[PDB]
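Supplementary Methods S3. Input chains for the assembly prediction are listed below.
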Amino acid sequence: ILKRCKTYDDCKDVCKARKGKCEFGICKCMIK
Amino acid sequence: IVGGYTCGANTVPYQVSLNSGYHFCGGSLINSQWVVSAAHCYKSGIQVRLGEDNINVVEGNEQFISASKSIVHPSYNSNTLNNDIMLIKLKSAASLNSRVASISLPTSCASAGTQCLISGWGNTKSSGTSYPDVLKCLKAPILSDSSCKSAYPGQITSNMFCAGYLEGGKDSCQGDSGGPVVCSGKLQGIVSWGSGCAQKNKPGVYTKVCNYVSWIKQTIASN
Ligand SMILES: [Ca+2]
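Predicted structure tokens for the full assembly:
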């Protein structure tokens, strides 16, 4: 998936409980 | 898509863009009223954009149709990514033509070694983030389950397959999720997940559509 973020908390909607990071402006929790 | 090529306008007429204010996932048109995508692409208020090439410019073949229903597989697991499939019903039927057309569902599963076409508007960089304007395409083979499980120990279910290149450099990426993997004219995969993009020994993982043909048919009927 493409979801922009500034911090990983911004990724909660798309990443749910998955571990990951906000990097290069986007959510990185393996899903595309 | 990393390491791919420009498809050419409307040469993948079943490819759709899912838009919730911006492009976030792909999908595949399977009939005039229904789109297959990934369960993790679910959001409320999805607008399906058909007939797109340049997703930033109005070129004259677009149909923008909101989802009336987004039916995630009831057994989708957002932790394991098992059953990562969703059906979107369009609020109204799309007009089918040369540039907006459906893709056939498989009657049997594909085999390792078969070449497939993967497409999308996702990131084109293995390091960093780009956003292409026009649709990108990649030819990639289905990989053995053994190499898939070696690349992703403990993570590959019967509803997933790997496709791509263990050497790296060619893969689907963020923004491609939900889009098509088409092999011998059949929608065999949905872009799902991977460890980064185009990394050595981390090929893309795809939802195995052939395991869901019955569910797709019953969901269309139920809605
Ligand atoms: Ca356009």
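Chain A touches chain B at residues 1-4, 13-14, 16-18, 24-28, 30-32 (CB under 8 Å). The pocket of calcium ion is lined by residues B 52, 54-55, 57-59, 62 (CB under 6 Å).
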